[PDB]
Amino acid sequence: SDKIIHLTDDSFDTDVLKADGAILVDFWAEWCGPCKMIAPILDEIADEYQGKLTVAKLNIDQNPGTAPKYGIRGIPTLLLFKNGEVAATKVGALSKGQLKEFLDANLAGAMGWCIFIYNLGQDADEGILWQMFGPFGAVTNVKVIRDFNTNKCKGFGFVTMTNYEEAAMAIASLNGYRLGDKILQVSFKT
Amino acid sequence: SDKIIHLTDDSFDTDVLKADAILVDFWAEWCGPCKMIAPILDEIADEYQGKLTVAKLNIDQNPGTAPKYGIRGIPTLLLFKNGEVAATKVGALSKGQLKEFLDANLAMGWCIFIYNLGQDADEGILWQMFGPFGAVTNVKVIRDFNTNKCKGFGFVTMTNYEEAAMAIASLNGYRLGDKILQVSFKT
Ligand code: NA
Ligand code: NA
Ligand code: NA
Ligand code: NA
């Protein structure tokens, strides 16, 4: 598809972070089975969602600098951006129907309970948050806030939990948890 | 409480791995929730005599043990059965809650095998891959006894078949770093 932006590490800020409107970024590379599976699907989506979504690709072999800035551990990974901010993430192979469902749910949009985690160490990552909160119930989204300049955790993140009771159980249990050398604060985001 | 065992790195093998159901509590002096739960342990230790042993491992005194079980914080409880991790519970909890946890783990879901993990793979990687697909109940990274490096494989347990299946269909062939993964239902 001629509608898909060919990203580079240098074009990322302009093409994604300053874009208006939703941008779906595909992290991929030539040595990757599921990349090849989803490539035709992304082409059809770029056509079928034109006017509501822009599709962008970043080859991580040629552009090794971006994926680490978003905690991206492998490929294929889809990141949905809105106004310069990650709204949602989808990892690995998927069907066209499944991609549409992801897009449609995240383009509509606020669902789940939001938890605020403060005083994370500079090495904290999405993995840490998944491992803390996942045992308590279904989590739909995790966001680690990273410093623009460093790529390190800026000291806080968020987790989104489907059911209120599970979220309050995680909060009651994880507040005060000492993760490495940092005692954590864990609360409902007001 | 005299019912507690006092673990050291050097006695871990003997007290935990070579012994036969124990609950290990990783803790330290600078830790709020550790103080909150330490009285609940003593109640459990006398209250579970015969059926379970409680032991403690101070992570300052004994800093070897934690990263060999991928423990990143305290407090963390690990339930071993015959030398392997059966279950884990992180953070503060009521007596009620620890009862629930011990009762149900003495005493499951769909078991997923992940193969070709790199040597630095940990439980966080697995939570992060599988968590988005729905309810995960347990993850286990298999480590080498000698290196404490991931041996190349792990397991995840997921409650709901359709979620497990979607995770398998999506994550098989995912390239995590320089390694392509196999993911399958365990047979
Ligand atoms: Na490539
Ligand atoms: Na939940
Ligand atoms: Na997600
Ligand atoms: Na599940």
Residue numbers in the entry:
A (entry chain A): 1 to 109, 111 to 191
B (entry chain B): 1 to 20, 22 to 108, 112 to 191
Structure paper excerpt:
HuR/ELAVL1 is an RNA-binding protein involved in differentiation and stress response that acts primarily by stabilizing messenger RNA (mRNA) targets. HuR specifically recognizes adenine and uridine-rich elements (ARE) and uridine-rich sequences in 3′ untranslated regions (3′UTRs) of mRNAs. Hu/ELAV proteins share a common protein architecture with two consecutive RRMs, separated from the third RRM (RRM3) by a less conserved, flexible hinge region of variable length. Here, we report crystal structures of HuR RRM3 free and bound to U- and AU-rich RNAs.
To overcome this limitation, we produced RRM3 fused to an N-terminal thioredoxin 1 (Trx) tag via a short uncleavable Gly-Ser-Ala-Met linker to improve solubility and suitability for crystallization. The fusion protein (Trx-RRM3) yielded crystals that diffracted to 2.0 Å. As expected, HuR RRM3 adopts a classical RRM fold with a canonical β1-α1-β2-β3-α2-β4 topology. Similar to a subset of RRMs (e.g. PPIE RRM, HuR RRM1) RRM3 has an additional four amino acid β3′ strand between α2 and β4. The β-sheet surface is predominantly positively charged, providing a suitable interface for the binding of RNA. The RRM3 RNP motifs (RNP1: IFIYNL, RNP2: KGFGFV) fit the consensus sequence suggesting the possibility for RNA binding by stacking of aromatic residues with the base moieties of RNA ligands. The analysis of free Trx-RRM3 and RNA-bound RRM3 crystal structures suggests several possible dimerization interfaces, three of them involving Trp261. SAXS data recorded for Trx-RRM3 at the lowest tested concentration could be fitted to the crystallographic structure of Trx-RRM3 dimer with χ2 = 1.17. Our crystal structure of RRM3 reveals that the neddylation sites (Lys283, Lys313) are localized and directed away from the main RNA binding and dimerization site.
